[PDB]
Write a protein that binds this DNA or RNA. Structure first.
Ligand code: NA
Ligand code: NA
Length: 580
DNA sequence: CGAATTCGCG
DNA sequence: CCGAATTCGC
């Protein structure tokens, strides 16, 4: 089968062409401070494999790596770039990233190596990474001959696949989306990950001790209320205790057995004192195992920072996801969990954390996209959207809106930006579905523009096969035509929701790029640390706070121009917690 | 090792 | 409408 290449033992001029497919291979899943196991270059002059100890010590090669006028095509350039940052080497001039290109063409493909991306264009002369490296325990770097040929075949595939991928992006009007949004974002994310977020480990350990005391006693409480010891963390054992030893009523099931989810438990609370205690235990136990212990496990003892990996090509909506640690689900809603954010601190003395977030970006996008007159006016008035929605669907004045009316209108708003559900709304408010349905319908006569939009987008998904965001991100919806009701329903919701959630994703991505540019133009030391779907988190010298208070919201509000304002709130403080 | 369950965020 | 921790059957 054998692909021919040069197994180079030193860098030559012809390897430094100003157009090349480049592979800088990091086999470790978590690429932070990870080995680079080999390098492949394919250009007009040939195909090359270089050992990294040689390549990365060659001044000419390193200068080439960092020369922006030397264009590279790659796959997961962020992976390579971060790995090089940790070695003090800058990667530049990446003009095409095959992973991001695949992602934009079809985020449902699940492309996670060069092979998977190559298959989209009938190119199969490259092996899947799994086949070469193995899976799980037996994952391993193979001897040099196998390694080098694998990396050269990936480089060769990248070299061949650029043009067909760019052609399709162009036909999709997604060329600018790749070149001007996702790829520049990828460098910014690479900076963010490398910078990391400093963690006060002493505070976490302290909070851990406080948890363990409480846990230890709630645990003991549960045992005497059950008159038995058992694993409270096993939903099956818990199910036996609750529903068999303590003959509690079964109000919901899982397919494996009894449901012990928190929504059920709340309903069981009037029956036995053990239910509130299990609930506490769950709350405290979640914080202990995931946010205390989980977090301390991934803080790097060298930097005392956590270095997340943002997955830029994973979600079907265009959102990022965040791993090891996941910094997009740090507690905020309940106070004792919110206290976790006290452990996230600036990375230097007399710096502060700065957080800015969009207020209701999704509903604002819906207003713009549906051109709903009522919804648009509400935001031009900067109304409380939940109170307005309560006024409208209950046909009452502002003074007549009760907290509970507001809470239900809130829930409809939540559900509306996730494509109603009829039944799902019912679950959230525990009402009946007929009840839930006529809230939904009362919504649609308050907002005929949104109704019209929901109907229009569903027909469009049917006729085209996909739906589109503001900046031309795509999601294919094959199930929109399915004869199975449930399946067809999910697809319909996605058709409604994806232009909403996806356009919000577009906007905050552009904002990140606009921000990064402005900060550098202003020569500020401030830099991005994290993004949480609708929220940007920075750190900077305390001396830069007042400028940032104007700069960051301006950038975020002006990222796109919609038929309604975008509104951004901001706070800063000594810790992430205090930035509220 | 991997399906299932629960819960955290948006 | 994402990811981490845990359990459990294998
Ligand atoms: Na040569
Ligand atoms: Na890479």
């Amino acid at each position: 089968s054998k692909m021919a290449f040069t197994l180079a033992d030193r860098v030559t001029e012809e390897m430094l062409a100003d157009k090349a497919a480049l592979v800088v291979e990091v086999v470790e899943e978590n690429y932070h401070d990870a080995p680079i196991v080999g390098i492949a270059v394919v250009n007009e002059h040939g195909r090359f494999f270089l050992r990294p100890e040689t390549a990365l010590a060659d001044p000419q090669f390193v200068a080439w790596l960092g020369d922006e006028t030397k264009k590279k095509s790659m796959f997961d350039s962020k992976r390579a770039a971060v790995a090089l940052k940790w070695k003090g080497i800058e990667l530049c001039g990446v003009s095409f990233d095959l992973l991001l290109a695949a992602y934009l063409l079809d985020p449902a493909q699940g492309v996670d190596d060069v092979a998977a991306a190559a298959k989209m264009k009938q190119y199969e002369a490259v092996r899947p990474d799994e086949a070469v490296y193995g899976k799980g325990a037996k994952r391993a770097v193979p001897d040099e001959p196998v390694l080098a040929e694998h990396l050269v075949r990936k480089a060769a595939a990248i070299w061949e696949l650029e043009r067909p991928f760019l052609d399709e992006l162009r036909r999709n009007e997604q060329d600018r989306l790749l070149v001007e949004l996702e790829q520049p974002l990828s460098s910014i994310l690479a900076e963010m990950e490398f910078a990391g977020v400093k963690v006060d480990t002493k505070r976490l350990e302290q909070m851990g001790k406080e948890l363990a005391e409480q846990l230890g006693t709630v645990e003991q409480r549960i045992y005497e209320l059950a008159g038995q010891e058992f694993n409270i963390n096993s939903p099956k054992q818990l199910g036996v205790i609750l529903f068999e030893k303590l003959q509690l009523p079964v109000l919901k099931k899982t397919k494996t057995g009894y449901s012990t989810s928190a929504d059920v438990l709340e309903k069981l609370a009037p029956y036995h004192e053990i239910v509130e205690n299990i609930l506490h235990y769950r709350q405290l136990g979640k914080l202990q195992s995931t946010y205390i212990e989980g977090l301390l496990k991934v803080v790097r003892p060298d930097t005392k920072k956590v270095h997340t990996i943002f997955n830029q090509a994973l979600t079907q909506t265009g959102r990022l996801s965040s791993t090891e640690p996941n910094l997009q689900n740090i507690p905020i809603r309940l106070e004792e969990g919110r206290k976790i954010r006290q452990a996230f601190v600036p990375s230097e003395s007399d710096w502060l954390i700065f957080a800015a977030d969009y207020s209701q970006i999704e509903l604002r996008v819906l207003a713009h996209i549906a051109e709903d007159d009522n919804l648009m006016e509400a935001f031009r008035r900067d109304l409380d959207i939940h109170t307005k929605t309560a006024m409208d669907i209950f046909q009452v004045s502002e003074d007549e809106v009760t907290p509970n009316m507001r809470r239900q209108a809130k829930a409809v708003n939540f559900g509306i930006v996730y494509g109603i559900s009829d039944y799902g709304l019912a679950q959230n408010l525990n009402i009946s579905r007929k009840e839930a349905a006529e809230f939904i319908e009362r919504y649609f006569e308050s907002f005929p523009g949104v109704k019209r939009y929901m109907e229009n987008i569903v027909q469009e998904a049917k006729q085209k096969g996909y739906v589109t965001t503001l900046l031309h991100r795509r999601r294919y919806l094959p199930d929109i035509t399915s004869r199975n009701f449930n399946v067809r329903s999910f697809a319909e919701r996605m058709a409604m929701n994806t232009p909403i959630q996806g356009s919000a994703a577009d906007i905050i991505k552009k904002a990140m790029i606009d921000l990064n540019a402005r900060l550098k133009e202003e020569r500020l030391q401030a830099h991005l640390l994290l993004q949480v779907h609708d929220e940007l988190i920075l750190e900077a010298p305390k001396e830069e706070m007042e400028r940032l208070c104007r700069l960051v919201p301006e950038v975020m509000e002006q990222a796109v121009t919609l038929r309604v304002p975008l509104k951004v709130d901001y706070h800063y403080g000594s810790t992430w917690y205090d930035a509220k």
